Amino acid sequence: LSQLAAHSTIPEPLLLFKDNRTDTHPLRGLSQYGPYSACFNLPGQVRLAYLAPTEHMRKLDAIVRELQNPATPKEATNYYVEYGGFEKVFKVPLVMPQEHLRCLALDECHGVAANGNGLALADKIVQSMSGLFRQKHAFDVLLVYLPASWKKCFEYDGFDLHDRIKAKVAPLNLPIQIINDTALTRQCRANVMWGVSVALYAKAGGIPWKLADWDKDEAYIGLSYAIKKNAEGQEYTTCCSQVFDPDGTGFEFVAYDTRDRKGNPYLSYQEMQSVLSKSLHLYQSSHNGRMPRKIFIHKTTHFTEDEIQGAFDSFSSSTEIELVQIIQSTNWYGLKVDPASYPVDRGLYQPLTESECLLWTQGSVMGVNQQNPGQPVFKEAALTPLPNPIMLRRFSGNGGWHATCSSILALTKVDWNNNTLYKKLPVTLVYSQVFADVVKQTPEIVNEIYDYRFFM
């Protein structure tokens, strides 16, 4: 009776780099082969501008200057590879901004820092960057710096400063990579340098890496939600995301609101069929008009009876819909025996019951570690001693745990904002959550869909 269904260990997915040289470890592949878009030369040179109070301007220069110099990791050295600088690693020059592009935060912002008005501070920062509206062609990425003195308005009830700033700047179509004191503080320089370098390259327009041998005929939808604490009740903001791969070589990643008022996070028939029809049109626009032969949907909560029918009624017969619910909090947890010195292998999925499986998104990975070669690496050994297996509840897929499990495992590796090996959730879920926060903060975004490079 103590016997369970045979677990199957999904192999670590590969990532595509320059000249289609595959590698599981992203940063090492970036060092050896370079960014995926290097062959296309899509970003070309990267030109970036600043927007910060003058009293901290030099700091930005320093970090940007130190982006152009090699760095050797001291923390998490078991995983991180030696940094070689933007010019060498990304095969792309990093452009020193000129004085015309460089901007200064307008003085009244400092004053409103005393007032504790987040909306006023965000609007004042937008007006400070307004000097860069006309010169959009000159620079590619803006580097807004928020000093620690503004921490009073960084986070407070009902307001998120970075969220508000990005929600205001996204309709203007200019990426920002907000930099706070944290990036400067942080001991291990190579960690932050990998993070900022990858973030800037991807925000310019390049693709640091892509899922190797990814199917272009499958679209992986992901729906998430966020809480707005209304005075009378609650507000649930639900937004969707897509990570499909177009007929070209690059791949797309776009999120959008699901919309007038919702008190529960469960989309009705009308709303769910509307968001799925919008997703279908989005996928059609990229692939000349071809149907998606298989659709994955990752929801944080269970699908309702009406919601499943809404998902079905939006597509034709040829499309295969595998509705999946992802559960992060479970009583189960696994121990690896041969007692293995390292935790259970990442990707080991255990079919518990019909339409219920345990996926170990978190776990040891073989051949990724740099120091002590040939040994497993546990990314989250700092936080947790053992990995926490997530649980998939299937609602619609006709059959096969392998499809959903491998798809999710590969999806947890293409978060460019993340500078570590993987995540806990597929990028669809995390980006839907991020855009849910963005929409919840700013209601006037619901009309338009946005790319991942803006909010990442």
Partner: protein
Amino acid sequence: VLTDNEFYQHYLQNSQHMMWFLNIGHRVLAALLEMNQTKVVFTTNFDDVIETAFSDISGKHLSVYGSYAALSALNTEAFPIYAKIHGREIHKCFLAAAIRFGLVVSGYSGRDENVMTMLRAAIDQNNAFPHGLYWTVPSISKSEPAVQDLITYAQGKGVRAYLVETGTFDEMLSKIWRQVKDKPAAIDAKVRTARVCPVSIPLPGPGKPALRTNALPVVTQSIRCGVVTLASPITFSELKERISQKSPKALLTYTVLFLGGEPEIRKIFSNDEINSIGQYYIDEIAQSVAASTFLKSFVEEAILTALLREKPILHRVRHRTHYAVIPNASAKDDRFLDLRKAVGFKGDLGYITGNVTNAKELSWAEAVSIRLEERGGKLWIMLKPEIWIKPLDRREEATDFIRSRRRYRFNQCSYQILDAWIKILFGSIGGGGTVNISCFPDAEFKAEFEIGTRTAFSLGVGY
């Protein structure tokens, strides 16, 4: 016998010539008839929907079965035909067809002597059912004995008849059609295998670097308990506060259900409100605790009470989750020595209850959160090691310490901790262990639960 998957493989390898002896299933059978596969289909019931589905698929009528019309159609090779047995004019047709190609029979349990002798007479010839005879039933054990007798008789005769267990006939045909190749667009548009609302994908075989989970199986399929009848309606909150103010030696819930001693019930409830006391037999424990959350809480609390009844370990509660916390007074027992080894750093003795290094009065101890998990139709006891803090509301003040102690409780250390805690909680190692616990053994309404001692585990399938 053979697994349904190998039957599917054999059918798909040679489906151009295989019979069918007898909605989504009927429609896809008509589609297969149109695709010229499985030319000849036999049936017993009226079931005029096969020809209607075929007409919808193709747009032309279906030959439905004269003196020897079936013989004339089969001999002239003018497939496809749909002949109904209606149970000698089919006897010769069935004999010739059995000579030609093999048969798969679904939706039939036998029980009819006419078709039984029909098939038995079809078997005898030199080359009868060359590809094989496949009697498919939703469940092998539920089939009538005559079917198994005929299968054994055919196997003895040298034929390759098999009895495979699959799902419902329509589900079987859907699974078959999802792997048939080179089908025209119109047919796939017509059928599309409808839609699968109640997803149910088979669990693979046990197989043989295994992983050891924390789940302990519960094989107690049913338990006996008591019911009290009230002359007035009650709310669950009133019962809960009555237990809190009285604290009897029994476990109570509303669904009013109880488990313990009758005098405790007479203490909690006066004679006037009590009508009578009877018994309840929850036949399916898993289904009951899945359907009703009150039963879930009641059963988990019953197992908890039975688990620490005779053991020195203390039982606490935190956000409605029960914990087996080690008392300071009994922390020096020899049974904890194994745990002393597991917590120990670099092969030494390890403290399991003490004072946090940087707080005035908080005292820490090792503990395990014990939960009930209803997965599928199985009950699992869920053990999670944890560090408990004596003040319930001051726990966060030891947060750093909690991070400090568990920082290096890696796979080997956590394995040792879990094994030691299982040994402490049950007294035996996970080898051949089905120990029994009982809550309130000296009461009329007691509960005995037999919990598998070995934690749930599975080995990766390999060659």
